[PDB]
Amino acid sequence: SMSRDPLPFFPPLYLGGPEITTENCEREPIHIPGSIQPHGALLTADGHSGEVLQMSLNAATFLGQEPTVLRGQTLAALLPEQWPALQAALPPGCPDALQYRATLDWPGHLSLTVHRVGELLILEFEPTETGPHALRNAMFALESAPNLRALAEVATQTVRELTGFDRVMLYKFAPDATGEVIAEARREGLHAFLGHRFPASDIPAQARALYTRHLLRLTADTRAAAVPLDPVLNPQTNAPTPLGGAVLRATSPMHMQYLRNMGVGSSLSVSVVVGGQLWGLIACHHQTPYVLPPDLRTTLEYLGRLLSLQVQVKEAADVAAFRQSLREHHARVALAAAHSLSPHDTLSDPALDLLGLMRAGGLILRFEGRWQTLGEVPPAPAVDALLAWLETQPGALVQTDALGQLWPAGADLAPSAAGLLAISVGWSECLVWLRPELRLEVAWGGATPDQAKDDLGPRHSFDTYLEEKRGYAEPWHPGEIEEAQDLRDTLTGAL
Amino acid sequence: SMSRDPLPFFPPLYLGGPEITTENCEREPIHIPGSIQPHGALLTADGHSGEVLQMSLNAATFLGQEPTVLRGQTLAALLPEQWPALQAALPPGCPDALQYRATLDWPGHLSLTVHRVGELLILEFEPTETGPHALRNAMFALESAPNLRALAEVATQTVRELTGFDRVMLYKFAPDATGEVIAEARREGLHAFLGHRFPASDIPAQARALYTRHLLRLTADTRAAAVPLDPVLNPQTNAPTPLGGAVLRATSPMHMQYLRNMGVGSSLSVSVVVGGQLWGLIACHHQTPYVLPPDLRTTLEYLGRLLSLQVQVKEAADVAAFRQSLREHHARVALAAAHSLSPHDTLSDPALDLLGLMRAGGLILRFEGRWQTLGEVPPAPAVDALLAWLETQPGALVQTDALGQLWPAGADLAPSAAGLLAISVGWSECLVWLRPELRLEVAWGGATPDQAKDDLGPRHSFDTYLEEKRGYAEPWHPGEIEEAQDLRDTLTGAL
Ligand SMILES: *C/C=C1\C(=C\c2[nH]c(/C=C3[NH+]=C(/C=C4\NC(=O)C(C=C)=C4C)C(C)=C\3CCC(=O)O)c(CCC(=O)O)c2C)NC(=O)[C@H]1C
Numbered sequence: 001s002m003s004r005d006p007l008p009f010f011p012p013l014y015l016g017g018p019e020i021t022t023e024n025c026e027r028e029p030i031h032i033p034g035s036i037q038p039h040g041a042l043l044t045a046d047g048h049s050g051e052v053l054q055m056s057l058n059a060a061t062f063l064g065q066e067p068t069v070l071r072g073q074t075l076a077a078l079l080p081e082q083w084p085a086l087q088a089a090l091p092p093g094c095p096d097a098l099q100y101r102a103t104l105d106w107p108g109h110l111s112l113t114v115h116r117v118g119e120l121l122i123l124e125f126e127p128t129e130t131g132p133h134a135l136r137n138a139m140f141a142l143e144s145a146p147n148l149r150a151l152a153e154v155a156t157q158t159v160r161e162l163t164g165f166d167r168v169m170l171y172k173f174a175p176d177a178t179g180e181v182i183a184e185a186r187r188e189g190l191h192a193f194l195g196h197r198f199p200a201s202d203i204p205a206q207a208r209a210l211y212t213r214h215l216l217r218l219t220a221d222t223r224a225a226a227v228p229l230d231p232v233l234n235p236q237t238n239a240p241t242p243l244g245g246a247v248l249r250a251t252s253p254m255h256m257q258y259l260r261n262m263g264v265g266s267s268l269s270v271s272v273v274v275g276g277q278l279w280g281l282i283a284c285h286h287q288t289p290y291v292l293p294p295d296l297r298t299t300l301e302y303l304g305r306l307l308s309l310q311v312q313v314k315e316a317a318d319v320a321a322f323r324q325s326l327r328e329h330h331a332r333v334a335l336a337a338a339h340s341l342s343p344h345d346t347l348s349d350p351a352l353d354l355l356g357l358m359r360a361g362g363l364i365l366r367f368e369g370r371w372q373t374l375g376e377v378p379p380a381p382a383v384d385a386l387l388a389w390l391e392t393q394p395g396a397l398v399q400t401d402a403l404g405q406l407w408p409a410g411a412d413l414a415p416s417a418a419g420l421l422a423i424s425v426g427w428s429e430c431l432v433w434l435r436p437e438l439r440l441e442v443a444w445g446g447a448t449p450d451q452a453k454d455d456l457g458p459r460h461s462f463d464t465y466l467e468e469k470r471g472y473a474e475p476w477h478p479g480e481i482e483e484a485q486d487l488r489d490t491l492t493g494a495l
Numbered sequence: 496s497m498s499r500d501p502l503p504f505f506p507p508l509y510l511g512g513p514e515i516t517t518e519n520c521e522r523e524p525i526h527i528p529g530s531i532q533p534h535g536a537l538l539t540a541d542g543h544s545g546e547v548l549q550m551s552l553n554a555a556t557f558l559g560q561e562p563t564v565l566r567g568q569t570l571a572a573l574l575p576e577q578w579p580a581l582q583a584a585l586p587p588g589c590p591d592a593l594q595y596r597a598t599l600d601w602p603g604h605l606s607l608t609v610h611r612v613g614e615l616l617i618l619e620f621e622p623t624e625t626g627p628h629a630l631r632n633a634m635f636a637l638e639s640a641p642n643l644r645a646l647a648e649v650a651t652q653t654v655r656e657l658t659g660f661d662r663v664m665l666y667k668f669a670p671d672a673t674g675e676v677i678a679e680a681r682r683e684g685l686h687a688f689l690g691h692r693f694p695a696s697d698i699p700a701q702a703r704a705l706y707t708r709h710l711l712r713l714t715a716d717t718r719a720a721a722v723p724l725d726p727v728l729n730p731q732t733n734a735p736t737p738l739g740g741a742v743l744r745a746t747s748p749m750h751m752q753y754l755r756n757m758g759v760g761s762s763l764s765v766s767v768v769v770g771g772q773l774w775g776l777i778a779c780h781h782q783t784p785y786v787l788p789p790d791l792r793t794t795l796e797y798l799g800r801l802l803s804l805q806v807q808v809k810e811a812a813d814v815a816a817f818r819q820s821l822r823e824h825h826a827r828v829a830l831a832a833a834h835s836l837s838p839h840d841t842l843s844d845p846a847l848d849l850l851g852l853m854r855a856g857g858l859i860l861r862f863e864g865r866w867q868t869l870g871e872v873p874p875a876p877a878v879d880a881l882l883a884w885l886e887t888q889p890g891a892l893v894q895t896d897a898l899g900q901l902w903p904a905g906a907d908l909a910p911s912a913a914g915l916l917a918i919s920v921g922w923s924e925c926l927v928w929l930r931p932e933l934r935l936e937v938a939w940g941g942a943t944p945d946q947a948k949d950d951l952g953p954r955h956s957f958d959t960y961l962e963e964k965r966g967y968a969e970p971w972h973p974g975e976i977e978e979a980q981d982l983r984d985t986l987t988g989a990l
């Protein structure tokens with residue numbers, strides 16, 4: 001499941017933490033690596049006095065002064081033009097997600113990004129210097145996309161045209177936290193991840209959780225050593241420094257090794273957040289090291305928000321059509337059922353077509369003291385056994401794309417009843433939809449969820465793995481389930 | 496109501512249409528004025544050949560060539576560098592909302608904005624030339640706002656800082672299509688519209704409908720004469736030219752007169768769209784004529800989308816808290832009711848506090864063959880009469896902030912029962928919440944809805960009008976209504 005809290009994390013390695021393997025990678029404290037990426041510099045100063053507390057060891061390269069020299073100095077002295085503005089944009093108690101950005105001139109322009117975590121100020125320094133109307137045209141192009149897929153294509157195309165990344169993907173999450181590449185823009189000859197599904201373990205729970213709050217992260221060079229902070233612990237608390245809000249945060253070694261195994265030299269992703277949930281990612285790859293300029297990144301962030309809105313719109317539409325047809329069918333069935341004196345004969349009416357309602361191949365109707373069937377159904381003893389299994393079921397509605405999971409002794413009923421959609425009307429009487437077993441191949445990107453726990457480190461295989469799943473049927477559309485509940489209410493109230 | 500289609504419009508004035516008054520202003524064809532604003536130029540060319548069909552009479556000022564000369568020429572000749580790109584960005588059959596923008600160099604840079612309507616291409620020409628990180632910082636500021644009001648304040652502040660407009664407002668629509676200024680950024684001494692409500696007639700249905708699809712519109716000079724198209728009719732159809740997608744579209748004379756009456760020299764608004772509905776406007780005013788540059792407008796449009804998302808987020812939160820408390824109370828009441836053998840005594844229990852549930856002052860419980868009350872209730876005969884009136888009611892749930900509207904002979908029950916929230920449990924038995932009459936003053940911006948139909952033109956009064964409404968109570972929070980339905984289900988299933 002994706003709607004869950006992350007597992008409690010281990011202490012980091014510099015605090016005596018355990019080595020991170022695939023057995024405990026869900027518990028790596030990625031938000032406190034105590035280090036940054038070498039393409040920029042980072043300061044941590046007191047939120048009230050502005051006294052510099054922690055510094056990256058490479059700060060001399062960007063600031064022109066040694067770490068031991070700047071340590072102890074106030075931001076009021078180092079940045080007299082930005083310090084009051086810095087304080088104004090980041091009032092005490094503000095979310096650590098709130099960022100303030102400014103440009104500075106120094107012996108080369110430096111982009112400064114500041115945010116506030118607890119009683120600490122985090123300052124990021126990156127060297128800095130696009131298309132004139134590319135963003136606007138992109139926004140209108142996204143809004144005028146006919147459907148989700150077209151929207152995804154427009155987004156990937158646009159991001160790749162703006163950045164020049166070797167690969168750009170729209171990665172959509174599923175409720176089971178697995179994801180799927182639903183659009184891809186790439187250079188010729190480069191391997192295609194389009195249409196492939198990846199295990200949830202590829203993006204562990206704490207990573208997803210972090211990515212719900214902080215919407216952009218990257219790895220400029222997957223072979224660059226991280227630059228530690230000095231001191232590594234926040235002097236205020238003698239505790240780790242929260243770097244979740246810092247784009248310069250050192251990437252988890254596990255994901256670094258993963259990217260190197262994928263043949264990726266540079267990575268970047270923007271979160272797509274819908275209704276407070278992580279819907280997907282704009283995932284970017286480059287075969288060679290690449291530091292994307294802060295302004296271009298800002299453009300990508302704008303794209304992230306626009307996409308976050310338009311996804312909701314397009315999915316609302318794609319739902320709306322099918323749901324309209326569905327509701328019309330519900331109107332027919334409800335009109336027919338209000339006047340029924342023989343529920344079996346009314347619901348077995350070919351005119352009503354209760355089978356085409358859920359696109360099912362089988363139907364079991366149970367009313368009065370008997371049951372009837374329609375279409376492809378299991379044998380009568382199997383029917384009675386199934387009805388008993390529903391009598392054992394506690395819920396009001398049962399839904400599955402594989403009955404073999406819920407009911408073991410019913411796994412042999414897969415040919416006619418692989419998928420099941422049952423509803424009770426106070427389990428003496430009920431309606432049961434059945435879908436037959438289907439030859440389904442899921443294209444995984446190198447491994448199934450079961451295979452990811454086999455290697456101690458990240459895998460090296462990312463080519464197409466066609467998992468042939470059996471005992472499964474056509475997945476129940478959520479709309480059809482809503483329709484099932486609506487039908488439960490209607491039939492309960494009418495009968 | 497705001498969720499409704501616009502009334503069928505009259506033919507325009509240049510086609511023998513009737514004069515527009517306040518009696519028929521809902522039927523003005525504002526989308527086809529046959530003219531534009533004089534601060535830019537407009538062309539209409541064939542969507543396939545690119546042959547220029549219609550031109551604004553002032554096109555010589557911006558293009559350097561007379562209208563009769565350019566008429567008949569193709570866009571392939573006039574814009575050889577943009578014509579293929581123009582065609583590529585706007586494929587045939589695309590929504591008329593899709594816009595393509597480019598910059599041109601000419602003897603002064605010209606901003607070109609093109610869109611496609613039916614078999615016609617519309618091209619807009621505007622002269623063109625902000626803060627470095629103002630937009631990004633604004634986006635993070637909006638996202639980190641604690642609540643809807645703070646969000647609104649951040650938005651107005653930011654827009655005013657970016658544009659320099661004398662007044663910037665966030666105007667939020669109500670279900671009855673009236674609106675309210677919920678935030679305002681203004682120059683010192685300028686009159687405040689903050690906290691005022693305006694009639695729906697101020698923004699007529701077809702205007703709102705148009706503003707749901709095309710998200711920005713303006714009036715650069717409220718005393719500038721419009722520039723007609725030549726020919727005024729599209730040669731393709733001998734019919735009016737759809738200008739809904741053109742920002743240069745001539746503003747309705749009615750709204751022009753309105754703005755002049757308000758003391759406004761220049762106006763501009765960006766639509767805030769949520770779930771396909773018009774949620775609100777970013778309304779901008781300037782006391783003097785002001786042509787906002789296209790790029791700054793683009794910034795405002797970005798702000799429009801960001802706001803469209805963040806509004807949904809903040810409202811989701813503000814709902815979520817109160818709804819949480821509410822659902823906890825529902826858990827208590829439902830737990831108590833599952834074991835009840837005396838519904839009256841269980842629901843009259845001070846421990847459960849069914850009155851504090853809906854913040855009501857009165858409660859009528861009807862069960863078995865009798866009724867009990869709790870708190871401030873009308874006399875017993877009035878109670879029986881009210882129960883009878885509920886027996887006459889067809890619905891399952893009744894909700895009103897003024898019982899005098901629904902029930903006339905109950906308008907005298909306003910002191911104890913002004914607001915009513917009744918629910919039936921299959922109307923033999925029921926629960927009724929009652930809220931007492933409250934002294935309510937609604938600050939209107941010059942007029943009530945009833946007063947707007949008195950003048951033949953737009954009004955001149957916009958100062959505070961405190962309408963003292965009587966027979967009304969504290970408005971039922973929608974959450975409380977959801978809770979009422981939930982309680983109906985629970986009590987129906989449990990009793
Ligand atoms: C539990 C151990 C493992 C694990 C750890 C891990 N991953 C990340 C960050 C990831 N992982 C991503 C996975 C993909 N990249 C792709 O291109 C595709 C599809 C083609 C997938 C499925 C992605 C996108 C990210 C985000 C970062 C980025 O864009 O580069 C982290 C967190 C990294 C950090 O920021 O600190 C961790 C700890 N990955 C495994 O495979 C598994 C062994």
Ligand SMILES: *C/C=C1\C(=C\c2[nH]c(/C=C3[NH+]=C(/C=C4\NC(=O)C(C=C)=C4C)C(C)=C\3CCC(=O)O)c(CCC(=O)O)c2C)NC(=O)[C@H]1C
Binds near residue numbers: 521778
């Ligand atoms: C039915 C006749 C009338 C009517 C017509 C009308 N109005 C508009 C456009 C409007 N009206 C607006 C109203 C307000 N402006 C404010 O500042 C405030 C609050 C302080 C309100 C309530 C607004 C904002 C617009 C949008 C345009 C803009 O931002 O300037 C139109 C359409 C105009 C067009 O684009 O063609 C029409 C036909 N207004 C009346 O008052 C009533 C008599």
